[PDB]
Amino acid sequence: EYKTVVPSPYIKCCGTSECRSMERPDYQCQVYTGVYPFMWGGAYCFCDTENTQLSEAYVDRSDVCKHDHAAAYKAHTAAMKATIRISYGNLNQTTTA
Amino acid sequence: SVTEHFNVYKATKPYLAYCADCGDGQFCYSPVAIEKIRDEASDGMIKIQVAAQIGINKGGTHEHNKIRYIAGHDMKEANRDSLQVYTSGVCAIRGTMGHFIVAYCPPGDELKVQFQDAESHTQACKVQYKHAPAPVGREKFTVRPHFGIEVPCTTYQLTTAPTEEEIDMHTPPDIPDITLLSQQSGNVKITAGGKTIRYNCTCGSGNVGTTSSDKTINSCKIAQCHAAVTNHDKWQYTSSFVPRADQLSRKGKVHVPFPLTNSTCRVPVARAPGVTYGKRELTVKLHPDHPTLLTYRSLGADPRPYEEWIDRYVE
Amino acid sequence: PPGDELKVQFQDAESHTQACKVQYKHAPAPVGREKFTVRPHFGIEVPCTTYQL
Amino acid sequence: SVTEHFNVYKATKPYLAYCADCGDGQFCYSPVAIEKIRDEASDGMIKIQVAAQ
Amino acid sequence: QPGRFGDIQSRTVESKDLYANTALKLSRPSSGTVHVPYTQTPSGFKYWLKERGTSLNDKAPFGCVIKTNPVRAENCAVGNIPVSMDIPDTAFTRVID
Amino acid sequence: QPGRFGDIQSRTVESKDLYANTALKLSRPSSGTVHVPYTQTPSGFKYWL
Ligand SMILES: *[C@@H]1O[C@H](CO)[C@@H](O[C@@H]2O[C@H](CO)[C@@H](O[C@@H]3O[C@H](CO[C@H]4O[C@H](CO)[C@@H](O)[C@H](O)[C@@H]4O)[C@@H](O)[C@H](O)[C@@H]3O)[C@H](O)[C@H]2NC(C)=O)[C@H](O)[C@H]1NC(C)=O
Ligand SMILES: *[C@@H]1O[C@H](CO)[C@@H](O[C@@H]2O[C@H](CO)[C@@H](O[C@@H]3O[C@H](CO)[C@@H](O)[C@H](O)[C@@H]3O)[C@H](O)[C@H]2NC(C)=O)[C@H](O)[C@H]1NC(C)=O
Ligand SMILES: *[C@@H]1O[C@H](CO)[C@@H](O[C@@H]2O[C@H](CO)[C@@H](O)[C@H](O)[C@H]2NC(C)=O)[C@H](O)[C@H]1NC(C)=O
Known part of the structure; x- marks a missing residue:
């Protein structure tokens, strides 16, 4: 399983930023202009449409790939080993070869 | 013990996030906004992350009966016996620590906390x-029986020890509030409720907000003016529903308890089927208490495997 | 929720x-073309009829 | 009445038995260990026997 | 491919490079809300887990019993095992006795 | 036969002799538990009902 890491977005109040590509698997970055977010106490930013929010998300190995994972293999040259009992005359022994 | 395991949270603070459905059919701003449910347990346990912190009081100390959260600006209190988890019926909570709740839940379509x-x-x-x-295994049971066999599975350990798995922590952002303003002739007052309040006024001076109460000369009144609380001494979780304060590296660091550990669960054992022997025929009576898997294959060169889940009596 | 009885x-x-x-x-x-039960945190708005509170 | 009908139990005592699933997913030793449930009723009534009195 | 087994791939458990193809998408936030909307393909690992079906143990020919640690097939009833024998004199008995 | 109509049979309501074929089975108790494990075929009467 993967893990989609979505950090808190940077909201540029009455300003503008640029997306910076990073070396992250399945990386996405988006700058949205004209945002007017709200909080519980009221409006977060100051202007009406002069604002940008930076959306960033990526895929990372889950915390339990170390525990929960499936392995893809190639199988060839199967080696056979068998357990045999030899009991003749007075002896009665078991060996593996 | 539990105290040197909970001391990691005191340096953190609960947060208020946007929950799209708070029991009723509408959104509101609640202190139990669910962030992410983790399901890595083979026995059916699920982990729920909530906005509020469970087991920590107003000061920061550890109790087994208090839940701290955000109601406006000030931290407040709650009792633990009222925390409940709902999917279709009532879920069995096994352990709570801060933002994280683990519980046993019946099959369902929703998750309400x-x-x-x-x-x-x-x-x-x-x-x-x-x-x-x-x-778990080959029988679709719901209640652990009083006799049977043990089948290995994965489960969350009910311990508070720190693990490699953790969650990001950072400083809280600016928290605006319209009520921190009152319109007065000339000197518009910004009631200084809190530690530090920032303002910026088009008609007034604005600039930095500093602290304490100030009497800003301006005719803009409530309009062209608003204030936000800043410099929170504690820390927030970088939730997807809260704006980022800044493009800097994270500040605090909090682990995720209840690590996945190897374990085993008792499973029921089905009754031995009744077999009547026909001439190279095999007929069996199947009496399952629950959906049971029947499987057979030929022992020769060309097997003919079978599959069917048995829920009633069949032949 | 969907059910078979109504008890008050x-x-x-x-x-x-x-x-x-x-x-x-x-x-x-x-409502629309998806059989959802919980209002999501993002999507589109579809007109409907409701009882005013 | 109810008193000369309950006088039969005073000479008895409740017991603690092994319940394999006490709400959560694990066993413990509870005073409501269910023994037998009877459904001889055509109207859907069931009888539950518990450890406690 | 996203949504199937192998949507994310890692060469080793100690691998630093991770390949991820989950068709992650970003979209405008709604007006007056800070939520970082994103739509992404679900994990193909869980899809495989609940669509795997039965393993090789349930379909192996010749009554093979498949175990892991290490991956092996035991007690398969097929073929012959040639035997070469080197018996000393001590084992045998004389016809005089 | 167990699990079908007539799994247990009695000639009369006042009968003292009762025939029962329910394939009752007994098995080891688990370690540290007193529960008398047993597995038995369900009643054929309720199945018929
Ligand atoms: C649940 O219990 C499982 C069994 O104990 C745990 O899985 C074990 O986890 C350890 C540590 O991560 C793994 O150790 C690795 O071993 C590899 C080599 O692979 C194995 O194969 C060789 C033969 O080539 C064999 O001799 C050994 O079994 C090797 O360990 C090393 O190269 C690594 O450095 C590392 O030591 C075990 O492989 C793994 N066991 C198995 C059978 O997968 C599991 O972590 C537990 N999960 C929990 C705690 O929930
Ligand atoms: C403190 O608030 C002042 C206003 O009191 C904010 O000033 C605002 O600054 C933005 C800068 O982006 C101006 O928006 C636009 O500027 C762009 C420049 O590319 C231009 O294309 C648009 O036409 C628009 O003007 C905005 O006009 C300006 N408002 C003013 C000067 O009244 C300032 O950003 C705030 N500073 C803090 C504390 O954040
Ligand atoms: C040789 O000795 C071994 C080990 O004592 C015998 O193995 C046991 O044989 C008897 C039954 O014949 C029982 O004690 C066990 O069922 C056997 N144990 C096994 C199969 O591991 C073995 O049969 C003897 N072989 C000979 C004399 O041919």
Whole structure:
């Protein structure tokens, strides 16, 4: 399983930023202009449409790939080993070869 | 013990996030906004992350009966016996630590977490979740039997020890509030409720907000003016529903308890089927208490495997 | 939620519970083209009819 | 009445038994260990035997 | 491919490079809300887990019993095992006795 | 036969002799538990009902 890491977005109040590509698997970055977010106490930013929010998300190995994972293999040259009992005359022994 | 395991949270603070469905059919701003449910346990346990912190009081100390959260600006209190988890019926909670709750839940279509508020109100957050745990072994049982066999599985350990898995922590952002303003002739007052309040006024001086109460000369009144609380001494979790304060590296660091550990679960054993021997025929009576898997294959060169889940009596 | 009955109860002044149960097909039709049960945190708005509070 | 009908139990005592699933997913030793449930009723009534009195 | 087994791939458990193809998408936030909307393909690992079906143990020919640690097939009833024998004199008995 | 109509049979309501074929089985108790494990075929009467 993967893990989609979505950090808190940077909201540029009455300003503008640029997306910076990073070396992250399945990386996405988006700058949205004209945002007017709200909080519980009221409006977060100051202007009406002069604002940008930076959306960033990526895929990372889950915390339990170390525990929960499936392995893809190639199988060839199967080696056979068998357990045999030899009991003749007075002896009665078991060996593996 | 529990104290040197909970001391990691005191440096943190609960947060208020946007929950799209708070029990009823509408959004509101609740302290139990569910962030992410983790389901890595083979026995059906699920982990729920909530906005409120469970087991920590107003000061920061550890109790087994208090839940701290955000109601406006000030931290407040809640009791633990009222935390409940709902999917289709009532879920069995096995352990709570801060933002994280683990519980045993029946199969369901939703995941609701609610507690009783200090205002005697009920505050909940509802999300959509496919909770359809896979069977452990070959019998689709729901209740652990009193006899059977043990089958290995994965489970969350009920310990508070720190683990490699953790969650990001950072400084809280600016928190605006319209009520921190009152319109007065000339000197518009910004009631200084809190530690530090920032303002910026088009007609007035604006600039930095500093602290304490100030009497800003301006005719803009409430309009062209608003204030936000800043410099929170504690820390927030970088939730997806809260704006980022800044493009800097994270500040605090909090682990995720209840690590996945190897374990085994008792499973029921089906009754031996009744076999009548026909001439190179095999007929069996199947009496399952629950959906039971019947499997056979030929021992020769060309096998003919079978599959069928048995829920009633069949032949 | 979707159900087969409709029970309404209150706690009586005698600390008793007084209820009334009736049979009702409560199977609401989907709003739009997805059979969802929980309002999401993002999406699109579809017109509908509601009771004003 | 009820008193000369309950006088039969005074000479008895409740017991603690092994319940394999006490709400949560694990066993413990509870005073409501269910022994047998009987459904001889055509109207849907069931009888539950518990450890406590 | 996203949504199937192998949507994310890692060469080793101690691998630093991770390949991820989950068709992650970003979209405008709604007005007056800070939520970082994103739509992404669900994990193909869980899809495989609940669509795997039965393993090789349930379909192996010749009554093979498949175990892991290490991956092996035991007690398969097929073929012959040639035997070469080197018996000393001590084992045998004389016809005089 | 167990699990079908007539799994247990009695000639009369006042009969003292009772025939029962329910394939009752007994098995080891688990370690540290007193529960008398047993597995038995369900009643054929309720199945017929
Ligand atoms: C549940 O219990 C499982 C069994 O104890 C745990 O899985 C074990 O986890 C350890 C540590 O991560 C793994 O150790 C690795 O071993 C590899 C080599 O692979 C194995 O194969 C060789 C033969 O080539 C064989 O001799 C050994 O079994 C090897 O360990 C090393 O190269 C690594 O450095 C590392 O030591 C075990 O492989 C793994 N066991 C198995 C059978 O997968 C599991 O972590 C536990 N999960 C929990 C705690 O929930
Ligand atoms: C403190 O608030 C002042 C206003 O009191 C904010 O000033 C605002 O600054 C933004 C800068 O982006 C101006 O928006 C636009 O500027 C762009 C420049 O590319 C231009 O294309 C648009 O036409 C628009 O003007 C905005 O006009 C300006 N408002 C003013 C000067 O009244 C300032 O950003 C705030 N500073 C803090 C504390 O954040
Ligand atoms: C040789 O000795 C071994 C080990 O004592 C015998 O193995 C046991 O044989 C008897 C039954 O014949 C029992 O004690 C066990 O069922 C056997 N144990 C096994 C199969 O591991 C073995 O049969 C002897 N072989 C000979 C004399 O041919």
